[PDB]
Amino acid sequence: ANCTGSFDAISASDFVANINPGWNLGNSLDATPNEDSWNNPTVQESTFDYVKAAGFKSVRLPVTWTHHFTSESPDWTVDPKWLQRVSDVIDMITSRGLYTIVNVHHDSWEWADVTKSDANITQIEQKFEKLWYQIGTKLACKSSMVAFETINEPPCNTAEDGAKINKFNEIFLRAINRAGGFNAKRVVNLVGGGMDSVKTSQWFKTPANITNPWALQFHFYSPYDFIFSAWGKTIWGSDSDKSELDSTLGLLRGNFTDVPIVLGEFDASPTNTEPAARWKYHDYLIRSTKKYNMSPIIWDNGLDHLDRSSGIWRDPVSIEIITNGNETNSLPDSTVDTSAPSQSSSAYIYHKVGTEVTDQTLPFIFNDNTLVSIQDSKGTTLKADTDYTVSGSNITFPASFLSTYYSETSEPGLLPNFTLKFSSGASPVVQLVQWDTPTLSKTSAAASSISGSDLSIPITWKGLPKLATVKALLNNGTYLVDDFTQWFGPFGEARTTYSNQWNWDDKNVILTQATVEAVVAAGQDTVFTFEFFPRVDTTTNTVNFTLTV
């Protein structure tokens, strides 16, 4: 490829500086087999208007090439129509002033997996170089506002596998420069094993005689328990929570001191996380990435944050924290003690159906900001010191005010929410929820009979239509899975993990098929306790389902 225009070379130091913060076009060009094969529609350019409008400077563009080869060995030719769509998407992003990073995505485990026992590594190395040569040529003439990323979370388990990770970086660089254009001065992102901080710290080595301006990219989905909703962990924000996060990011930067560091994916998704812990986590992540000179990019698979169809951010409180990292935000407080028998969150006004309406006190972490005003989701501004009262970290709400939203007999569900405008930082939102214990359409079932697939139990949600976690106990008292949760406190013992074991939708609570075969295998009746928010205790806001055997 030959390029007719000019190219403003940018340094890796400057590139990462100007991309902060970023957002992912998730489950789009990375979907399999086609871009709308998963949860997302055909990509539309308006989406990038929203990303710009919400304050992001850059867009990371994951692309799965696995299903877009028109020839096999040797040529391994990629469809020109796909290369054209990828090229056009990059144009939509840059032409709205957003920086771009494009990659080879789920090819990482679909065919580029070197840890698999039968992996033809010579055929992998060829197919990778054939691929980046074709990507390189088509994008060879793109402005410096486009960067190339080697490969997404590449499987890696050994020091021996890590050298194969570094080789992926070399094959990639030799292909992109042989493709010509502006690529010899294009910014690139090299990767380590699994894009894990430690695997990269343990095994990553910089390619010898490298000439492209380059930065390092890693992903952060830690701590596993809170981020993935495992073992009943529904709280984050303790001093140990903070030290462990700061420790993970600090040992990476300590290994790679003068290297620009891109945090390519991160997400405490509003789908599964409790809001106050979620907002505390993103605040301390942005705070951490700034301390270690790292530019973050949030993962958004289309459902976690931006609704592309409306321009509405589902979690606008988060978005403001990442897009204005130079401000101190005051956040609602929440339980962070792993041994507490009750859990609270200042992101909610909870009221139980059939109880008297009482005053509600929500502790906030003001962080030297002052409260300016409060606004409900119906447009009325609340009257200070009559409709709500501040005392230090407490923000107290009169029963007479709250009765103007719910009663002892009013319907259960989500009520309006309060948006609290502070002197600086993001403006957190408190959600009023009228809640009762949900009821299920079934209370027991023969594991044998319900076998086949996942077990859907229709549920009457009452309040928050989210499932918090599930307890799993055999009849003789042994835990169904993961014995080690016995050290996880009143809300963690015998609890199971989101998606793997339990799930939910609009009309059901879901036990995955794998859970049932753990009950069938255990061979004794198992009590599953579905738990919901608020977790006022381990028993009130719960409902039992038993699998007989």
Ligand X SMILES: *[C@H]1O[C@H](CO)[C@@H](O)[C@H](O)[C@@H]1O
Ligand Y SMILES: *[C@@H]1O[C@H](CO)[C@@H](O[C@@H]2O[C@H](CO)[C@@H](O[C@@H]3O[C@H](CO)[C@@H](O)[C@H](O[C@H]4O[C@H](CO)[C@@H](O)[C@H](O)[C@@H]4O)[C@@H]3O)[C@H](O)[C@H]2NC(C)=O)[C@H](O)[C@H]1NC(C)=O
Ligand Z SMILES: *[C@@H]1O[C@H](CO)[C@@H](O[C@@H]2O[C@H](CO)[C@@H](O[C@@H]3O[C@H](CO[C@H]4O[C@H](CO[C@H]5O[C@H](CO)[C@@H](O)[C@H](O)[C@@H]5O)[C@@H](O)[C@H](O[C@H]5O[C@H](CO)[C@@H](O)[C@H](O)[C@@H]5O)[C@@H]4O)[C@@H](O)[C@H](O)[C@@H]3O)[C@H](O)[C@H]2NC(C)=O)[C@H](O)[C@H]1NC(C)=O
Ligand U SMILES: *[C@@H]1O[C@H](CO)[C@@H](O[C@@H]2O[C@H](CO)[C@@H](O[C@@H]3O[C@H](CO)[C@@H](O)[C@H](O[C@H]4O[C@H](CO)[C@@H](O)[C@H](O)[C@@H]4O[C@H]4O[C@H](CO)[C@@H](O)[C@H](O)[C@@H]4O)[C@@H]3O)[C@H](O)[C@H]2NC(C)=O)[C@H](O)[C@H]1NC(C)=O
Ligand V SMILES: OC[C@H]1O[C@@H](O[C@H]2[C@H](O)[C@@H](O)[C@H](O)O[C@@H]2CO[C@H]2OC[C@@H](O)[C@H](O)[C@H]2O)[C@H](O)[C@@H](O)[C@@H]1O
Residues numbered 302 to 321 that lie near ligand U (CB under 6 A) are: 302-303, 307-310, 312, 314
Q: Which amino acid type is present at position 425?
A: G
Using CB under 6 A, which of 390, 440, 527, 549 touches ligand Z? Answer: 527
For the chain, the first-to-last Cα distance in angstroms comes to: 66
Question: 27, 152, 29, 141: which is closest to 81 by C-alpha?
Answer: 29
Q: What mask of x and - would describe binding to ligand U in positions 430 to 459, judged by CB under 6 A?
A: -x----------------------------
Using CB under 6 A, which of 170, 218, 529, 532 touches ligand Z? Answer: 529
Mind giving me the DSSP string for 368-388?
T--EEEEEETTSPBP-BTTTB
| H-state helical runs in 353-507 | 399-402, 447-450
Q: Which amino acid type is present at position 402?
A: L
SS3 61: strand
Q: Which does 371 bind (CB under 5 to 8 A by kind): ligand X, ligand Y, ligand U, none?
A: none
Edge to edge, what strands does the sheet with 526-531 contain? 444-446, 542-548, 526-531, 469-474
Q: Which does 372 bind (CB under 5 to 8 A by kind): ligand Y, ligand Z, ligand U, none?
A: none
Q: Which two tokens stand for residue 57?
A: 């400077």
Q: Which does 536 bind (CB under 5 to 8 A by kind): ligand Z, ligand X, ligand U, none?
A: ligand X
59, 98 contact by CB (below 8 A) = yes
Using CB under 6 A, which of 326, 355, 391, 409 touches ligand NAG? Answer: 391
Q: How far is CA 237 from the centre of its chain?
A: 17
Residues numbered 354 to 383 that lie near ligand NAG (CB under 6 A) are: 361
Residues numbered 509 to 538 that lie near ligand X (CB under 6 A) are: 536
Using CB under 6 A, which of 32, 123, 126, 202 touches ligand Y? Answer: 202
Residues numbered 267 to 286 that lie near ligand NAG (CB under 6 A) are: none
Comparing CB distances to ligand X, the nearer of 32 and 342 is 342
Q: How far apart are CA 150 and CA 161, in angstroms?
A: 16
Using CB under 6 A, which of 493, 500, 520, 549 touches ligand Z? Answer: 493
Comparing CB distances to ligand X, the nearer of 150 and 344 is 344
* 149 contacts: CB under 8 Å, gap ≥ 6: 60, 101, 102, 103, 104, 188, 189, 191, 217, 264
Min CB(392)–ligand NAG separation in Å: 4
Q: Considering the rule CB under 6 A, would residue 45 count as an interface residue with ligand U?
A: no
Q: Which does 201 bind (CB under 5 to 8 A by kind): ligand Y, ligand X, ligand Z, none?
A: ligand Y
Q: Considering the rule CB under 6 A, would residue 251 count as an interface residue with ligand Y?
A: yes
Apex 152 CA angle, 149 and 156, nearest 5: 125
Instruction: Name the residue number minimizing CB distance to ligand X.
Output: 344
Using CB under 6 A, which of 74, 97, 254, 458 touches ligand Y? Answer: 254
Min CB(62)–ligand V separation in Å: 9
Q: Considering the rule CB under 6 A, would residue 394 count as an interface residue with ligand NAG?
A: yes
**Which is it for strands 261-263 and 22-24: parallel, antiparallel or unpaired?**
unpaired
Residues numbered 329 to 368 that lie near ligand X (CB under 6 A) are: 342, 344
Q: Which two tokens stand for residue 84?
A: 């054209």
Q: How far apart are CA 279 and CA 329, in angstroms?
A: 10
Question: How many Cα atoms occupy the beta-carbon half-sphere of 267 within 13 Å?
Answer: 21
495, 471 contact by CB (below 8 A) = yes
Q: Which amino acid type is present at position 237?
A: G
Phi then psi for residue 465, to 5 deg, are -80, 35
Query: CB 46: neighbour CB atoms within 10 A?
Result: 12
> Which CA distances in Å does 459 have to 126, 472, 516?
52, 18, 19
Min CB(523)–ligand NAG separation in Å: 6
Q: Considering the rule CB under 6 A, would residue 444 count as an interface residue with ligand Z?
A: no
Task: Please report, as ranges, the residues that interact with ligand NAG according to CB under 6 A.
Answer: 73, 120, 122-123, 126, 361, 391-392, 394, 474, 476-478, 522-524
Task: Please report, as ranges, the residues that interact with ligand Z according to CB under 6 A.
Answer: 473, 476-477, 493-494, 527, 529, 539, 542-544
Task: Please report, as ranges, the residues that interact with ligand U according to CB under 6 A.
Answer: 39-41, 302-303, 307-310, 312, 314, 377, 417, 429, 431
Task: Please report, as ranges, the residues that interact with ligand Y according to CB under 6 A.
Answer: 198, 201-202, 251, 254-255
